[PDB]
Each structure stands twice: as structure tokens, then as C-alpha cells.
């Protein structure tokens, strides 16, 4: 038969990494590719083809949670799962209306600052000379 019309869900996929290596895809892109499911929607009219393929990434911990409880001024041990899984000794204090934390440990100049402005929560995470700024909106 020649009629390839339909919606097709991938059922089996073998030597997908061998083929991608032959095309020089890097290790990381392959590791993301083999975690994708594929749907193919084929519209065929004689010898005219419309082939639409959808790759969906499926990562475990698609909804990962990280919980930290602390009191201002009370040093606590933090295990930075969700990031680098290191042990730091963390201490949170107020500097004005800015919540400031120092994470003493292997990394020097590691810590963060958290504050409110308007309807938004600002967070800046520091490690050495690298600052990451994140902004959150109130729901």
C-alpha cells in the first residue's frame, strides 16, 4: 500500500543515537533527543505530501519542588539540590527591607538577596562575580 495519510505516534525507535552520531549531533543534543516522543501528521494527496513532525520533551521532574524553611538570624544547613547539590551553612538577615543570605561553603562570595518592589519579588543570586537576577509577579 502507498497511502501514508494519518496521525502517527512513534512506537519504536532503534539506533537513533547511532544515526545522530553519524550526523555529528553533540552528546547533549542527543540526550535531549532520545527523551522526546514524536507524532507525525501526514497529509497525502497523490504524490503531494505535507509531513508535520512534533517532538515533545519528557523530563522526569517536569514539576520538581525545592523546599527551604529558615528563620532570620538562625544559621541552618542548606543542601542546594535543584542546583549544585552542595552543603552550605546559610544565614539570612534583614538589611533594610532586603532579605540577604550568605551561604558559607566551598564557593566564595555565594549568597542571595530577595526583596519586594511594587507587585514583584526580586531575587539576585550571587556566586563569585556571577549575578543572576530573577523577577517574580504576584499571583
User: Which residues from 56-85 bind its own copies, rule CB under 8 A?
Assistant: 56-57, 59, 61-73, 80, 82-84
Query: What CA–CA distance (Å, rounded) separates 111 from 89?
Result: 10
For the CB of residue 102, give the shortest distance to its own copies in the complex, in Å.
Answer: 15
For the CB of residue 38, give the shortest distance to its own copies in the complex, in Å.
Answer: 8
**109-to-6, 36, 125, 126 alpha-carbon distances in Å:** 57, 38, 10, 7
**Interaction between residue 9 and its own copies (CB under 8 A):** yes
Give the three-class secondary structure for 30.
helix
For the CB of residue 45, give the shortest distance to its own copies in the complex, in Å.
Answer: 10
Strand pairing category for 111-117 and 98-104: antiparallel
Cell digits for 43? 497529509
Single residue of 90, 91, 92, 111 touching its own copies by CB under 8 A = 92
Cell digits for 26? 553533540
**Interaction between residue 104 and its own copies (CB under 8 A):** no
Single residue of 20, 100, 102, 113 touching its own copies by CB under 8 A = 20
**Interaction between residue 34 and its own copies (CB under 8 A):** no
Q: Return the number of the residue (77 or 129) whose C-beta is nearest its own copies.
A: 129
Single residue of 100, 102, 113, 121 touching its own copies by CB under 8 A = 121
Give the three-class secondary structure for 104.
strand
**Interaction between residue 100 and its own copies (CB under 8 A):** no
**124-to-61, 66, 85, 113, 139 alpha-carbon distances in Å:** 24, 17, 19, 5, 20
**Interaction between residue 27 and its own copies (CB under 8 A):** yes
Amino acid at each position: 500500500t502507498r497511502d501514508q495519510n494519518g496521525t502517527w505516534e512513534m512506537e519504536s525507535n532503534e539506533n537513533f543515537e547511532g544515526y545522530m552520531k553519524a550526523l555529528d549531533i553533540d552528546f547533549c543534543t542527543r540526550k535531549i533527543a532520545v527523551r522526546c516522543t514524536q507524532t507525525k501528521v501526514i497529509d497525502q494527496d497523490g504524490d503531494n505530501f505535507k509531513d508535520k513532525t512534533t517532538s515533545t520533551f519528557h523530563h522526569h521532574h517536569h514539576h520538581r519542588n525545592y523546599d527551604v524553611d529558615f528563620t532570620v538570624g538562625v544559621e541552618f544547613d542548606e543542601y542546594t539540590k535543584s542546583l549544585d547539590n552542595r552543603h552550605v551553612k546559610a544565614l539570612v538577615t534583614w538589611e533594610g527591607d532586603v532579605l540577604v543570605c550568605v551561604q558559607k561553603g566551598e564557593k566564595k562570595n555565594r549568597g542571595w538577596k530577595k526583596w519586594i518592589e511594587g507587585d514583584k519579588l526580586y531575587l539576585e543570586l550571587t556566586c563569585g562575580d556571577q549575578v543572576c537576577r530573577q523577577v517574580f509577579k504576584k499571583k
